[PDB]
Amino acid sequence: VLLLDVTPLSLGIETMGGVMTTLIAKNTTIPTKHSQVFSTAEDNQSAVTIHVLQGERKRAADNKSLGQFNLDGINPAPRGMPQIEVTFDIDADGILHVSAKDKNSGKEQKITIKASSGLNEDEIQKMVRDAEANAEADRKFEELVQTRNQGDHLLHSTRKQVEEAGDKLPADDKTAIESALTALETALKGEDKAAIEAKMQELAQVSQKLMEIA
């Protein structure tokens, strides 16, 4: 063949922490289809918003927004348990079909994004060069987000285990845990990845009695 219909940029969705997660890679030949199962980032979430992105930047806000839609009717469950299957499907028409499906409630929502959406040829090259020019900063952000998300799970799991523990946890330790939790929460708001890591370790340090109780 002398030519191919290909994606000139990555297509994906925004995920926890404000990152773009890619579903169809840059330079994928069409037709193509890809599905992936995701879950929730907190306990009892009843709906999710699927924010569709085009581009090459790691921070979702720096990509081109193609659309969004909701999937509601998610049964309340602990975080990470619901199964939300997100499908990107682009056939020869160059129309992007995005669906999200709750594999338990069976509820599904879909949208279509026409061939003309997203960046034009000039904006496509600028986006590729902006990605290049900011590669440094983009990778730091990706690593910081992975660390943030890991700290967030630890914070929230520790808080659950304190609840289940009740008066079984010594007042002394309960107070020391609560302190470390607050410090980690503070470190999470910042941009210093090592500081989050030290606060994760410091919280696990004071949790020994808590972990035995569980």
């Binding site: 969705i13 926890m16 997660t21 999710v48 918003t49």
Partner: peptide, 8 residues
């Protein structure tokens, strides 16, 4: 590494 969608 499992991934999660944010709360709306």
């Amino acid at each position: 590494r499992p991934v999660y969608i944010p709360r709306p």
